[PDB]
Design a protein around this ligand. Structure first.
Ligand SMILES: Nc1ncnc2c1ncn2[C@@H]1O[C@H](COP(=O)(O)OP(=O)(O)O)[C@@H](O)[C@H]1O
Ligand SMILES: [Mg+2]
Ligand SMILES: [Zn+2]
Lengths: 193, 238
């Protein structure tokens, strides 16, 4: 199942939902929560309980009439002429699925030479501690402690397990309490973006 | 049991008779004026008082009370037969339904010779051409009943009730007679409705389709159909 994104919403409208079908190799990809582009076809599939009122329907061209004792009444007449209700729904078949915007060895191999050059340039800078604070939060004034804490939470720690069957946390949790208008929701919005 | 022809004649003479009551202090032909208005589209329903009938014949009133539906139908037919007599002019302004009725009567006169044999199925339904409704007013001598005490003994009778309204349904059209057109002929088929649900037809009973054995198939039409105003009411005791 896929959903229309927020940027495509018109005034006062709920996002549209659509069904996508994957066949064979393309079945693997497109996990839940992703934001992806699809390329394929738009195809019509029949439906059953759409018509509570009579609508378009099919029949046979043969000019056949009933005989006494076998008169083409309701049920028998409909079954004899092969009448089917024409109901339909729209379904999308996908042949290509891609990310809208795109195991350490695998990550290293995926990156190109220029991307790896940029990564290495970033790696050996002490100002990485400072510049990352200003880059993610350019407009918010002060509160550098909160920026450092949020960056540390983003990078996170290492999880471990012990021999007795217990487990140890590797994640970090952060709480912010403040007076009104102290840019408290701006950090949340920036991290969401 | 009594034959319906005699009572139909009695109904006709009762409708033709009364001169008595007038509001302005005179003697006025009330039912004649009502019928003249009914001739054109200046009145689309008629109410009959069962107190006025009681002057000449009470047995008619009792039979109406116990067998109300049959007498309603008889009254409708009697008034429909009386309508041509009182007619004096053609319609000044008419709507779609009148256009169908006039056209159908005109082609009936065009085609049907007086001597040719006509099948009982070949006639028009009575209520399709009719456009007036008849209703009854409860007798003043009759005492209104209570919702709790109407039971199987009262099924089919004429009753008068007093109550409080709690639920009313929005107005929606109700089917009276359905009209069908064949796929390969100019004939028209009529299906009366007297059930909460009905099954639409398929094949054409028209004579030409039968003679050719063409197997033409019917289609519904909404313009030719007859519809009535229908509402549902809920009442409770005081
Ligand atoms: N230190 C700051 N630097 C820049 N803008 C700020 C700062 N403090 C407050 N603001 C502005 O004031 C508003 C604060 O509202 P908000 O952060 O939603 O308050 P709260 O999160 O406490 O409900 C924001 O729109 C922000 O633009
Ligand atoms: Mg806030
Ligand atoms: Zn036909």
């Amino acid at each position: 199942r896929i959903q229309e994104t927020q940027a495509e919403l018109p005034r006062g409208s709920i996002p549209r939902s659509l069904e996508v079908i994957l066949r064979a190799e393309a079945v693997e990809s497109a996990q839940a929560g992703d934001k992806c582009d699809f390329t394929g076809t738009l195809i019509v599939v029949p439906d059953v309980s759409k018509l509570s009122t009579p609508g378009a329907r099919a029949e046979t061209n043969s000019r056949v009439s009933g005989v006494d004792g076998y008169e083409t009444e309701g049920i028998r007449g409909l079954r004899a002429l092969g009448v089917r209700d024409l109901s339909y729904r729209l379904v999308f078949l996908a042949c290509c699925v891609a990310p809208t915007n795109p195991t350490a060895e695998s990550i290293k191999n995926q990156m190109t030479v220029k991307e790896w050059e940029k990564v290495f340039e970033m790696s050996q800078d002490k100002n990485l501690y400072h510049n990352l604070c200003t880059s993610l939060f350019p407009t918010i004034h002060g509160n550098d402690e909160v920026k450092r804490g949020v960056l540390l939470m983003l990078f996170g720690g290492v999880p471990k397990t012990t021999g007795e069957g217990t487990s140890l946390r590797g994640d970090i949790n952060v709480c912010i309490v403040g007076d009104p208008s102290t840019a408290k929701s701006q950090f949340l919005k920036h991290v969401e973006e | 049991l009594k034959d319906y022809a005699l009572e139909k004649e009695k109904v006709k003479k009762f409708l033709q008779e009364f001169y008595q009551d007038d509001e302005l202090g005179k003697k006025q032909f009330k039912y004649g004026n009502q019928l003249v208005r009914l001739a054109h589209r200046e009145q689309v329903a008629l109410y009959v008082d069962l107190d006025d009938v009681a002057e000449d014949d009470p047995e008619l009133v009792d039979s109406i009370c116990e067998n109300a539906r049959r007498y309603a139908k008889l009254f409708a037919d009697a008034v429909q037969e009386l309508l041509p007599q009182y007619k004096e002019r053609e319609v000044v302004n008419k709507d779609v339904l009148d256009v169908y009725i006039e056209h159908r009567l005109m082609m009936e006169q065009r085609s049907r010779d007086p001597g040719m044999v006509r099948s009982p199925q070949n006639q028009y339904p009575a209520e399709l051409m009719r456009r007036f409704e008849l209703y009854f007013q409860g007798p003043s001598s009759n005492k209104p009943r209570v919702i709790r005490e109407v039971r199987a003994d009262s099924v089919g009778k004429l009753v008068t009730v007093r109550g409080i309204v709690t639920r009313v349904s929005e107005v929606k059209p109700k089917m009276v007679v359905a009209t069908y057109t064949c796929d390969q002929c100019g004939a028209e088929t009529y299906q009366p409705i007297q059930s909460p649900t009905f099954m639409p037809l398929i094949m054409c009973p028209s004579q030409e389709c039968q003679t050719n054995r063409s197997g033409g198939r019917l289609y519904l039409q909404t313009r030719g159909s007859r519809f009535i105003k229908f509402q549902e009411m809920k009442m409770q005791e005081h």
